């Protein structure tokens, strides 16, 4: 088995900005090496071929050097546009097969920005269900890393939350997240005040949104 | 020059999988076409490739469940993968490459993909609104969504105003629970001042159970 490792495996700089993207093989595989770019929900673009060629209506700024175990890929000058994920993918074996390596994310670096800590109290039609969710969103900040907890009546959680963010958004270049505590209603029941606590880079002290249970 | 896939994607185990692409409009000499899969949050895999000539290499790990075929009468390339488990489950593209021009140039074209989904069972999302309040307004705009809450199996896609809401709108990653199911949220923020007049409704649709649900989305006060 011929393993293609990808490195660095994240990365975050601006538009202007010169990034070069290393991929190492195993063992050599003289210059069978190609380079994909692939966006979120879009299908992957081959982007160099044979270690060094320009696929068709690559743009200039793209290239690619290396022979045998160690290759890199080169954008000159990023465009907005260059921001995803870069695969390498490597040839061996006859018959012929394939291999991807693991993938190098390249981000925008923006502005820090703080969230917005918003809050949502379980919903009428769910109380009636026999569960209650309560739903912490944090709306358009940077960087990615955020951190959130979870206080009922002054005591706080674990294992019954879950976190979800989105990927950078194409516009503003910030991330959101949404944090979701479950409950049974019996337990839901048992407490007043739920509290969602937030940490993030952009932040000087904790902020918490409340609400207490059927005031709303 | 544009590649289409056609195929079903909802499958049971055991069944066969079959998919279609067609590439329309240069000439072309010689060719290869390739199929690639990615199961969602993970990586590429290839699958095999086929020339003009109909000579195809396969990926081992596959072979003896793969086929790959071409009808060169209208730049046509199909897949067939049979005895299909939930490992099978992906994104397929096929991958349409020739070489053109005097320096012989390889230009590369990719299917926009097809979800293929095997799964035994099925279970609806409840959909449940996160009305807009003061705890969730910020200087005229105010956030609200829609809790979709433990569907089987991913994926479910969340609209607002049946598409007529689109700026703005932050559709989750499903998490997987440790439970076995699916939940995600989606969120928008609006004008406050909308909020009296302007309607707003998510369209959760889960095709893997063929639902599709529509719900109103009303503002509270604390």
């Known amino acids: 088995e011929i393993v293609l490792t990808q490195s660095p495996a994240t990365l975050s700089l601006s538009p202007g900005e010169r990034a070069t993207l290393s991929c190492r093989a195993s063992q050599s595989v003289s210059s069978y090496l190609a380079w994909y770019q692939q966006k979120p929900g879009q299908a992957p673009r081959l982007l160099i071929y044979?270690?060094?060629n320009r696929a068709t209506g690559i743009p200039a700024r793209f290239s690619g050097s290396g022979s045998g175990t160690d290759f890199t890929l080169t954008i000159s000058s990023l465009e907005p546009e260059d921001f995803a994920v870069y695969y390498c993918?490597?040839?061996?074996?006859?018959?012929?097969?394939?291999?991807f390596g693991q993938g190098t994310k390249l981000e925008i670096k923006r502005t820090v920005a703080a969230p917005s800590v918003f809050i949502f109290p379980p919903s009428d039609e769910q109380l009636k269900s026999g569960t209650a969710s309560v739903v912490c969103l944090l709306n358009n900040f940077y960087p990615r890393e955020a951190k959130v907890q979870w206080k009922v009546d002054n005591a706080l959680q674990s294992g019954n939350s879950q976190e979800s963010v989105t990927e950078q958004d194409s516009k503003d270049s910030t991330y959101s997240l949404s944090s979701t505590l479950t409950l049974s209603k019996a337990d839901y029941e048992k407490h007043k005040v739920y509290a969602c606590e937030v940490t993030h880079q952009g932040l000087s002290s904790p902020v918490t949104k409340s609400f207490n249970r059927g005031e709303c | 020059v544009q590649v289409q896939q056609w195929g079903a994607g909802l499958l049971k185990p055991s069944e066969t999988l079959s998919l279609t692409c067609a590439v329309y409009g240069g000439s072309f000499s010689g060719y290869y076409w390739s199929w690639i899969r990615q199961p969602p949050g993970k990586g590429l895999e290839w699958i095999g490739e086929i020339n003009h000539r109909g000579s195809t290499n396969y990926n081992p790990s596959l072979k003896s469940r793969v086929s790959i075929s071409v009808d060169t009468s209208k730049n046509q390339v199909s897949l067939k993968l049979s005895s299909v488990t939930a490992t099978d489950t992906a994104v397929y593209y096929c991958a349409f490459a020739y070489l053109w021009g005097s320096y012989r140039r390889r230009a590369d074209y990719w299917g926009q993909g097809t979800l293929v989904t095997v799964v035994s069972r099925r279970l609806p999302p409840s959909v449940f609104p996160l009305a807009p309040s003061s705890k969730s307004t910020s200087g005229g705009t105010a956030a609200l969504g829609c809790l979709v809450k433990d569907y089987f199996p991913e994926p479910v896609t969340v609209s607002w105003n049946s598409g007529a809401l689109t700026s703005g709108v932050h559709t989750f990653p499903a998490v997987l629970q440790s439970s076995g199911l699916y939940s995600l949220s989606s969120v928008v923020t609006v004008p406050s001042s909308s909020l009296g007049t302007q309607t707003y409704i998510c369209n959760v649709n889960h095709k893997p159970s063929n639902t599709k649900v529509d719900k109103r989305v009303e503002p509270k006060s604390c």
């Open positions: 044979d270690a060094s």
């Open positions: 993918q490597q040839r061996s074996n006859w018959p012929p097969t394939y291999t």
